[PDB]
Design an enzyme around this catalytic site. Sequence first.
Site, PDB file in Angstrom:
ATOM      1  N   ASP A  40     -11.736  -1.069   7.914  1.00 21.28           N
ATOM      2  CA  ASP A  40     -11.464   0.102   6.673  1.00 21.28           C
ATOM      3  C   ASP A  40     -10.219   0.058   6.452  1.00 21.28           C
ATOM      4  OD1 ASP A  40      -9.384  -1.075   9.190  1.00 21.28           O
ATOM      5  OD2 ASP A  40      -8.942   0.397   9.241  1.00 21.28           O
ATOM      6  N   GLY A  74      -6.941  -1.664  14.158  1.00 27.04           N
ATOM      7  CA  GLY A  74      -7.616  -2.044  15.721  1.00 27.04           C
ATOM      8  C   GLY A  74      -9.006  -2.908  14.847  1.00 27.04           C
ATOM      9  N   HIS A  75     -10.042  -2.619  15.432  1.00 25.87           N
ATOM     10  CA  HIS A  75     -11.170  -3.811  14.477  1.00 25.87           C
ATOM     11  C   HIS A  75     -11.666  -3.003  13.759  1.00 25.87           C
ATOM     12  CE1 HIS A  75     -10.769  -5.906  18.340  1.00 25.87           C
ATOM     13  NE2 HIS A  75     -10.785  -7.013  17.809  1.00 25.87           N
ATOM     14  N   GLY A  76     -11.981  -3.119  12.240  1.00 22.08           N
ATOM     15  CA  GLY A  76     -12.068  -2.576  10.949  1.00 22.08           C
ATOM     16  C   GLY A  76     -13.323  -2.587  11.168  1.00 22.08           C
ATOM     17  N   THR A  84      -2.701  -4.297   8.765  1.00 25.47           N
ATOM     18  CA  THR A  84      -2.309  -3.575   7.672  1.00 25.47           C
ATOM     19  C   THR A  84      -1.326  -2.828   8.405  1.00 25.47           C
ATOM     20  OG1 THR A  84      -4.861  -4.225   8.495  1.00 25.47           O
ATOM     21  CG2 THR A  84      -4.485  -1.821   7.738  1.00 25.47           C
ATOM     22  N   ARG A 104     -15.416  -9.401   2.211  1.00 28.87           N
ATOM     23  CA  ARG A 104     -15.210  -8.663   3.807  1.00 28.87           C
ATOM     24  C   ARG A 104     -14.304  -7.150   3.621  1.00 28.87           C
ATOM     25  NH1 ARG A 104     -11.130  -6.792   7.154  1.00 28.87           N
ATOM     26  NH2 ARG A 104     -12.313  -6.592   8.909  1.00 28.87           N
ATOM     27  N   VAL A 105     -14.595  -6.782   3.308  1.00 26.56           N
ATOM     28  CA  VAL A 105     -13.934  -5.752   3.232  1.00 26.56           C
ATOM     29  C   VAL A 105     -13.889  -4.779   4.446  1.00 26.56           C
ATOM     30  CG1 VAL A 105     -14.034  -3.060   1.955  1.00 26.56           C
ATOM     31  CG2 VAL A 105     -14.529  -5.026   1.168  1.00 26.56           C
TER      32      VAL A 105
END
Lengths: 136, 136, 139, 139
Positions: free
Chosen positions: C32, C53-55, C1, C29-30
């Site tokens: 942030d 970070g983790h979405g 990202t 899957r989507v």
Amino acid sequence: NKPIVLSTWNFGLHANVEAWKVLSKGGKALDAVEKGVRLVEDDPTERSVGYGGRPDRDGRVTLDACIMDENYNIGSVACMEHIKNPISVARAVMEKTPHVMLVGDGALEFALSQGFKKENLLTAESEKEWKEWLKT
Amino acid sequence: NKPIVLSTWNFGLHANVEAWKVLSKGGKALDAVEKGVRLVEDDPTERSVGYGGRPDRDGRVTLDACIMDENYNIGSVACMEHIKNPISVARAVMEKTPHVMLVGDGALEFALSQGFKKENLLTAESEKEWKEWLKT
Amino acid sequence: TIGMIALDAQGNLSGACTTSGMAYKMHGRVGDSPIIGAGLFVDNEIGAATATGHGEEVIRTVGTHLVVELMNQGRTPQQACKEAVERIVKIVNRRGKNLKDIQVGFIALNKKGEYGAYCIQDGFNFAVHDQKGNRLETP
Amino acid sequence: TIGMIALDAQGNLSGACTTSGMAYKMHGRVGDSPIIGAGLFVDNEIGAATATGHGEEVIRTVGTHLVVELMNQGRTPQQACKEAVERIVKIVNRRGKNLKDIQVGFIALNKKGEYGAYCIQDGFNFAVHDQKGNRLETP
């Protein structure tokens, strides 16, 4: 202190140089951040954005992006396949539709009606690695 | 002042009665709000939610939903076709996946792997009205 | 990202966020990155922020909208990012999760051209380019 | 769209939001109802809120996360909903839009079982069911 650009991670340094080409000439922040991230979407070796992007578990490269300007205009696309530059399709959602977020097929359908065309976003490298993950 | 349920619009009254069946018995807010909105998704008369919902411009009925409990567990589906109850598929995203939002085909694919039934959500009434809008 | 935010010579803010997501994620899957209160938020009267970070965790905390409201409440970009992450850590603890498994970080910018960044875990870097040139800093 | 939030006898909050969206929307269009800072936000230490109105406008303002943070900053549910809408009105004037073309409203609940609601335009109703009965109120 202006102009000033910040981006995430190391690829952000090189992204920042493209954005700064707009900003140093007194251009709009909007065009600058769009130009900046496009560099990374365009790069096959940048496996976490656009064209080099590693696929979902079924091997489809789906991309997500959004943009927001200085006056609350926003645009997003999510889980869109085949368009290397989701940030520009998102920008077009913002400027060209009465909507703010389009996902899946409808996002690609819109992208193609705006003149973007389908490319193959799964590099040989990423297909190789996906097929290693499928064994593991 | 507990239990207490609030929902949107005049159809929220009848939804509130289903939710209250859980809440008055000392049931969990999570199960209550899920039961409550399902009533409206189930009703072909309530053409802004679930079954009977008015389609997109190409006549596709596409549903969006999300759920959030008391400890930041969340689940969402967006632009999903064929499942009468998106709130339960969203609940399953939350409880059954490492993810928080699934959209499009992947949302339906997941719904069907969880035992949800594929249905035709376009009511004759909504197909009729969509075809009136297509003339206008 | 890659998330990117900027203040131009007029003093206007804008930002962009783009990703291919989690490698080998579930189809459809989507994360942030296309969600406005989560991956990117800009208010030209206060400031802008983008997440890393983790979405899933950024969606769950609507982190970047939180950062910009903390700057609205009177925090500098640095203080807003830190206070945002510290709330997120308390939530990860409330959910009985091991902090080592969670990573959420933000970079933030305000109207004055002040900037800041902070993360749950070490190992993230971000690039800053103003008139002192381009540099990679560490939260 | 129906949005629903509740406080149970254990004193725990949860909420749900569901829609078929805007009629004759573009294919793949999604509004605020699937989005966590926008259509629905719940914090068990604070309160919960769900949105009504134009999906696009609720996404743009991350309205329901704003309502819950205003309750976090001491506002009652009613005050939080009102202050949220009043900020949104100031933003559509910055966008040079006509307010009559915009509609955004919220219903909110806090940990005490206090509730409130507010909208840009008239014409929205919401149902409240507590131990005194079920009733349709007007913001």
